[PDB]
Scaffold this active site. Sequence first.
Site, PDB file in Angstrom:
ATOM      1  N   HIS A 501       0.818  -1.236   0.000  1.00 23.12           N
ATOM      2  CA  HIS A 501       0.000   0.000   0.000  1.00 23.12           C
ATOM      3  C   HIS A 501       0.851   1.286   0.000  1.00 23.12           C
ATOM      4  O   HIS A 501       0.611   2.173   0.842  1.00 23.12           O
ATOM      5  CB  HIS A 501      -1.000   0.012   1.206  1.00 23.12           C
ATOM      6  CG  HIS A 501      -1.925  -1.175   1.264  1.00 23.12           C
ATOM      7  ND1 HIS A 501      -2.512  -1.605   2.441  1.00 23.12           N
ATOM      8  CD2 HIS A 501      -2.372  -2.017   0.295  1.00 23.12           C
ATOM      9  CE1 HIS A 501      -3.254  -2.672   2.195  1.00 23.12           C
ATOM     10  NE2 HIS A 501      -3.201  -2.936   0.899  1.00 23.12           N
ATOM     11  N   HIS A 545      -6.881  -0.448   2.898  1.00 26.46           N
ATOM     12  CA  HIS A 545      -6.187  -0.963   1.732  1.00 26.46           C
ATOM     13  C   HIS A 545      -6.414   0.104   0.657  1.00 26.46           C
ATOM     14  O   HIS A 545      -7.495   0.714   0.605  1.00 26.46           O
ATOM     15  CB  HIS A 545      -6.772  -2.318   1.349  1.00 26.46           C
ATOM     16  CG  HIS A 545      -6.737  -3.316   2.465  1.00 26.46           C
ATOM     17  ND1 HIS A 545      -6.257  -4.592   2.310  1.00 26.46           N
ATOM     18  CD2 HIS A 545      -7.106  -3.216   3.762  1.00 26.46           C
ATOM     19  CE1 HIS A 545      -6.351  -5.242   3.458  1.00 26.46           C
ATOM     20  NE2 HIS A 545      -6.857  -4.423   4.357  1.00 26.46           N
TER      21      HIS A 545
HETATM   22  C1  FAD Z   1       0.001  -8.135  -4.385  1.00 25.36           C
HETATM   23  C2  FAD Z   1      -0.868  -6.915  -4.093  1.00 25.36           C
HETATM   24  C3  FAD Z   1      -2.105  -7.063  -3.462  1.00 25.36           C
HETATM   25  C4  FAD Z   1      -2.913  -5.950  -3.170  1.00 25.36           C
HETATM   26  N1  FAD Z   1      -4.136  -6.113  -2.575  1.00 25.36           N
HETATM   27  C5  FAD Z   1      -4.953  -5.072  -2.321  1.00 25.36           C
HETATM   28  C6  FAD Z   1      -6.307  -5.201  -1.705  1.00 25.36           C
HETATM   29  O1  FAD Z   1      -6.756  -6.320  -1.393  1.00 25.36           O
HETATM   30  N2  FAD Z   1      -7.041  -4.083  -1.496  1.00 25.36           N
HETATM   31  C7  FAD Z   1      -6.584  -2.849  -1.812  1.00 25.36           C
HETATM   32  O2  FAD Z   1      -7.277  -1.818  -1.605  1.00 25.36           O
HETATM   33  N3  FAD Z   1      -5.365  -2.674  -2.362  1.00 25.36           N
HETATM   34  C8  FAD Z   1      -4.534  -3.694  -2.647  1.00 25.36           C
HETATM   35  N4  FAD Z   1      -3.285  -3.469  -3.245  1.00 25.36           N
HETATM   36  C9  FAD Z   1      -2.896  -2.092  -3.538  1.00 25.36           C
HETATM   37  C10 FAD Z   1      -3.597  -1.482  -4.711  1.00 25.36           C
HETATM   38  O3  FAD Z   1      -3.562  -2.485  -5.717  1.00 25.36           O
HETATM   39  C11 FAD Z   1      -2.780  -0.271  -5.118  1.00 25.36           C
HETATM   40  O4  FAD Z   1      -2.485   0.523  -3.952  1.00 25.36           O
HETATM   41  C12 FAD Z   1      -3.506   0.548  -6.166  1.00 25.36           C
HETATM   42  O5  FAD Z   1      -4.173  -0.321  -7.088  1.00 25.36           O
HETATM   43  C13 FAD Z   1      -2.517   1.365  -6.952  1.00 25.36           C
HETATM   44  O6  FAD Z   1      -3.221   2.279  -7.799  1.00 25.36           O
HETATM   45  P1  FAD Z   1      -2.443   3.326  -8.753  1.00 25.36           P
HETATM   46  O7  FAD Z   1      -3.383   3.861  -9.804  1.00 25.36           O
HETATM   47  O8  FAD Z   1      -1.724   4.276  -7.848  1.00 25.36           O
HETATM   48  O9  FAD Z   1      -1.255   2.482  -9.454  1.00 25.36           O
HETATM   49  P2  FAD Z   1      -1.321   1.116 -10.290  1.00 25.36           P
HETATM   50  O10 FAD Z   1      -2.699   0.521 -10.305  1.00 25.36           O
HETATM   51  O11 FAD Z   1      -0.135   0.308  -9.870  1.00 25.36           O
HETATM   52  O12 FAD Z   1      -1.127   1.729 -11.747  1.00 25.36           O
HETATM   53  C14 FAD Z   1       0.110   2.153 -12.314  1.00 25.36           C
HETATM   54  C15 FAD Z   1       0.057   1.730 -13.786  1.00 25.36           C
HETATM   55  O13 FAD Z   1       0.999   2.487 -14.558  1.00 25.36           O
HETATM   56  C16 FAD Z   1       1.844   1.609 -15.325  1.00 25.36           C
HETATM   57  N5  FAD Z   1       3.141   2.304 -15.465  1.00 25.36           N
HETATM   58  C17 FAD Z   1       4.051   2.566 -14.494  1.00 25.36           C
HETATM   59  N6  FAD Z   1       5.098   3.245 -14.998  1.00 25.36           N
HETATM   60  C18 FAD Z   1       4.846   3.433 -16.303  1.00 25.36           C
HETATM   61  C19 FAD Z   1       5.548   4.081 -17.437  1.00 25.36           C
HETATM   62  N7  FAD Z   1       6.747   4.666 -17.247  1.00 25.36           N
HETATM   63  N8  FAD Z   1       4.953   4.036 -18.644  1.00 25.36           N
HETATM   64  C20 FAD Z   1       3.758   3.447 -18.873  1.00 25.36           C
HETATM   65  N9  FAD Z   1       3.074   2.827 -17.902  1.00 25.36           N
HETATM   66  C21 FAD Z   1       3.562   2.808 -16.619  1.00 25.36           C
HETATM   67  C22 FAD Z   1       1.881   0.305 -14.561  1.00 25.36           C
HETATM   68  O14 FAD Z   1       2.196  -0.799 -15.429  1.00 25.36           O
HETATM   69  C23 FAD Z   1       0.461   0.260 -13.995  1.00 25.36           C
HETATM   70  O15 FAD Z   1      -0.447  -0.315 -14.940  1.00 25.36           O
HETATM   71  C24 FAD Z   1      -2.450  -4.575  -3.545  1.00 25.36           C
HETATM   72  C25 FAD Z   1      -1.233  -4.433  -4.198  1.00 25.36           C
HETATM   73  C26 FAD Z   1      -0.426  -5.547  -4.480  1.00 25.36           C
HETATM   74  C27 FAD Z   1       0.925  -5.323  -5.128  1.00 25.36           C
HETATM   75  C1  ANN Z   2      -3.660 -11.690   4.332  1.00 25.69           C
HETATM   76  O1  ANN Z   2      -4.609 -11.004   3.513  1.00 25.69           O
HETATM   77  C2  ANN Z   2      -4.322  -9.863   2.799  1.00 25.69           C
HETATM   78  C3  ANN Z   2      -5.376  -8.997   2.443  1.00 25.69           C
HETATM   79  C4  ANN Z   2      -5.138  -7.828   1.703  1.00 25.69           C
HETATM   80  C5  ANN Z   2      -3.826  -7.525   1.320  1.00 25.69           C
HETATM   81  C6  ANN Z   2      -3.504  -6.272   0.554  1.00 25.69           C
HETATM   82  O2  ANN Z   2      -4.230  -5.254   0.621  1.00 25.69           O
HETATM   83  O3  ANN Z   2      -2.454  -6.254  -0.112  1.00 25.69           O
HETATM   84  C7  ANN Z   2      -2.772  -8.390   1.676  1.00 25.69           C
HETATM   85  C8  ANN Z   2      -3.002  -9.552   2.415  1.00 25.69           C
END
Ligand code: FAD
Ligand code: ANN
Length: 565
Positions: A501, A545
């Site tokens: 996060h 999250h």
């Molecule tokens: C394993 C994992 C599990 C998660 N689980 C949860 C959950 O259960 N609940 C929750 O609320 N959050 C969760 N998160 C967090 C949540 O996914 C992120 O905090 C949020 O989606 C990020 O949003 P964003 O728009 O900031 O970036 P992102 O959605 O990461 O978007 C960035 C995008 O830009 C692209 N990009 C980057 N640099 C460049 C460039 N130079 N040129 C072109 N494209 C580029 C990337 O490929 C990506 O598609 C999780 C994250 C991970 C890694």
């Molecule tokens: C153990 O379960 C979780 C649930 C949510 C996330 C996340 O937000 O990335 C990670 C672990």
Amino acid sequence: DFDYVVVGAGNAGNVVAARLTEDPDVSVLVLEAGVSDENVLGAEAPLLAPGLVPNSIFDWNYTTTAQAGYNGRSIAYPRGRMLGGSSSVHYMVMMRGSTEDFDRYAAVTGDEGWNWDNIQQFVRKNEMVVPPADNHNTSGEFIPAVHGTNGSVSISLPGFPTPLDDRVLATTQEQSEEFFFNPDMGTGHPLGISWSIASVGNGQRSSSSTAYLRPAQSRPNLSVLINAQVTKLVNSGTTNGLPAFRCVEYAEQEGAPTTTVCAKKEVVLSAGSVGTPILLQLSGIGDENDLSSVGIDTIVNNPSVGRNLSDHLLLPAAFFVNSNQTFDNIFRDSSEFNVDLDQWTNTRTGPLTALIANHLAWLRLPSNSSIFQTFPDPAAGPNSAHWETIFSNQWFHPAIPRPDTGSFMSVTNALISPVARGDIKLATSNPFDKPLINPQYLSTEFDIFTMIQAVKSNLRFLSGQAWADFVIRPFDPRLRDPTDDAAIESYIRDNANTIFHPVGTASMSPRGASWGVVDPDLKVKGVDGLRIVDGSILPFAPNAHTQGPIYLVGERGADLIKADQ
Ligand SMILES: Cc1cc2nc3c(=O)[nH]c(=O)nc-3n(C[C@H](O)[C@H](O)[C@H](O)COP(=O)(O)OP(=O)(O)OC[C@H]3O[C@@H](n4cnc5c(N)ncnc54)[C@H](O)[C@@H]3O)c2cc1C
Ligand SMILES: COc1ccc(C(=O)O)cc1
């Protein structure tokens, strides 16, 4: 050519692209570095989400620097690299944060347009509650009135039950002083034990690409390009007496030729909390000293770029359980997996619709805790959390594979209000090299103290009557004794990780202010024609999250952009 260029087809980027193209006279080009999200079973069936990243073609394959707080361990730092961004790889849990999170965002920026009351309109634009996959009765699991009914992203209560559910509920009655029930986090009051709500509809992932990009695919004023990594933001002149950045260079991969495109109105950075600051630094927007140390000429000196990184640290812990209903064997036995896959394929029901956790606990330190002698309260406010506890019907540990034998439940903590701050920096001027991600986990006494307390709390929780015939023992023997602080701290420093996060690397702050990277309207400070709409703008870790708060940034960001047209 295009009115807008959106860099990153991610959680927030897709909101901006879809919202802007609602107007037929506004054209948007989206540039995504990664591949398509289509035909990725792992990105569709909810239970398959944890397999997807970190070491794969759907990940950026980032890691942290070595963390002294973690006894020198370096950890995987997964980030989605595909349409939908991290919303295509995340675990789908949905909440918005505390009222105190957003009020603090408003206070810190001088902009009341952030702030709990004024953000609610965007919850309603962003989400619609749909039935859970098993179609169970959701009465008393959430409050319908605080959630959207019409918005873009499908959300639902857990689609598959676990043997944990009744025992978590019983613990809210048996141990009600510490572990009281919370009807819905959407009230803006996070504390207590609530049912998980998740971005899942008809038993499958609802991501920013499925929710925003796909329905908008037949729009002639929207173009989406995959395999297009933006390698430089290009200083394209001087409008309003400031350096203008309305042109970008992108390439398919390292060594490939770079294409140039320009936006008539604005370039919108939605590259996320890692992607955004590094691209800025590669373009000469950042810390002068750090930039010249890697051979980059500074066009805009701002040492806030890539600084003020907050994250929620993760603590995992598995426990052997007396049950034949944990999800563990789905990942060991092909026959069981294939039966579940056929059921998911044909009906969109069954174990593959299940979440990582059906219940979440949000918790505070006692207001008289010894730690408050030396530290002011780092929580967003008196109604906000210090930590979170997540109950999973299986083994869950990002750095240790599932054992061949044993049935498990896991109790995962997140540090919600860290005192630690970190940074993201360039190791080289090459856009295809990995950045240096240093979150500085467990580098303050507050952060380690709270985690020791979180463990003691987990053990009180599991010592309850509801667990008597279920929990056998912890996987790790350092969790056998709640009074052994040395063993507990050793456990933490060897097992702690990240819950993915990150925020803050391009913090919003008031117009013309001290530090920060963007203004409250998300325009980059000291630049014209450049806007940041993603997780990097949020100046504090929220009580959530981050998909939920980031979607709000995306929806408001779009309105902020439309207001300057
Ligand atoms: C394993 C994992 C599990 C998660 N689980 C949860 C959950 O259960 N609940 C929750 O609320 N959050 C969760 N998160 C967090 C949540 O996914 C992120 O905090 C949020 O989606 C990020 O949003 P964003 O728009 O900031 O970036 P992102 O959605 O990461 O978007 C960035 C995008 O830009 C692209 N990009 C980057 N640099 C460049 C460039 N130079 N040129 C072109 N494209 C580029 C990337 O490929 C990506 O598609 C999780 C994250 C991970 C890694
Ligand atoms: C153990 O379960 C979780 C649930 C949510 C996330 C996340 O937000 O990335 C990670 C672990």
